[PDB]
């Protein structure tokens, strides 16, 4: 029953309205960090900060979820996008892995990131996790890690979100 997915707060949007895409995990054993690569159509959707609406540049950082926010484990965050190609690449992780393990309180289920999409056009479009050569061993553009610092190579599914503004 383990997975990573994206959920939209809204699956329909007029031009100028912001859709919040939340990256969510379920039952990832001893989860310590993620990196995901996301493909969208930049003519249809503009990536923006979901809280403020400030448009993403290629360095804009993801909005935090409920996981990876314990400051005692030294969270770090990356955003390295190609907005002209409709590619976002987002990552967040803990650095003080030993301290995290000593808590015996693993984070395994919950939201991990939020990104905003403002509609530029009304037409049907998709946001999906997508393979990147920057993550050659990714599972459909996803890499998840445990608190020993290792990539989790099996045991979870990638569930793509539904279409936006379909029909």
């Amino acid at each position: 029953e383990s997975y990573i997915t994206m959920n939209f707060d809204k699956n329909t949007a007029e031009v100028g309205q912001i859709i919040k895409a939340t990256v969510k995990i379920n039952k990832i054993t001893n989860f310590s960090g993620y990196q995901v690569n996301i493909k969208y159509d930049p003519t249809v959707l503009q990536a923006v900060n979901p809280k403020t609406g400030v448009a993403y540049t290629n360095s804009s950082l993801p909005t935090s979820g409920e996981l990876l926010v314990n400051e005692d484990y030294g969270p770090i965050v990356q955003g390295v996008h190609k907005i002209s190609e409709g590619i976002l690449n987002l990552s967040r992780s803990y650095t003080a892995l030993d301290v995290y393990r000593a808590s015996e309180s693993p984070e395994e289920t919950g939201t991990v990131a939020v990104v905003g999409f403002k509609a530029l056009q009304k037409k049907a479009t998709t946001v999906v996790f997508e393979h990147s050569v920057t993550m050659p061993n990714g599972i459909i553009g996803t890499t998840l890690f445990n608190w020993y610092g290792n990539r989790i190579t099996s045991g979870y599914s990638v569930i793509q979100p539904g279409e936006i503004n379909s029909e």
Partner: protein, 156 residues
Amino acid sequence: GTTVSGYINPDFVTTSTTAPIVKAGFTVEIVGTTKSAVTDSNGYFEIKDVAAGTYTVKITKANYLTREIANVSVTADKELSTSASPILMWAGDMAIGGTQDGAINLEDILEICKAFGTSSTDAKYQVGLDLNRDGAISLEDVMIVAKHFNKVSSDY
């Protein structure tokens, strides 16, 4: 043939102590030939007697992202870079289990974090994880990787 030379520098801040450790040991190869050289403590390489032609020059070192410079025209003695404007190399494509994946990504950061907060007086410190060779495995090493995060060789 003629001489192809130049300078390679890791892309992070160094001191008089750490510079000679990290500038040495980059292999520079003229692809499709037997001609190569290794950088000295100043980052300098010199490849003797290269036949005229157009080549890819490949630069490698453990725990660095490999760089290939395409379309290098050799017709005479040729300096590819200077000490003032060296060829930069990006630390943090880590050899994990003896193998690098050809990308700088989160796996590289977490490989270092397995030893987060250690120093060279600790048994758990590994010099290869101490990218800047300052005797500590710290956030500074992680930030060296983060500088060129989510990149592959074609991004040079």
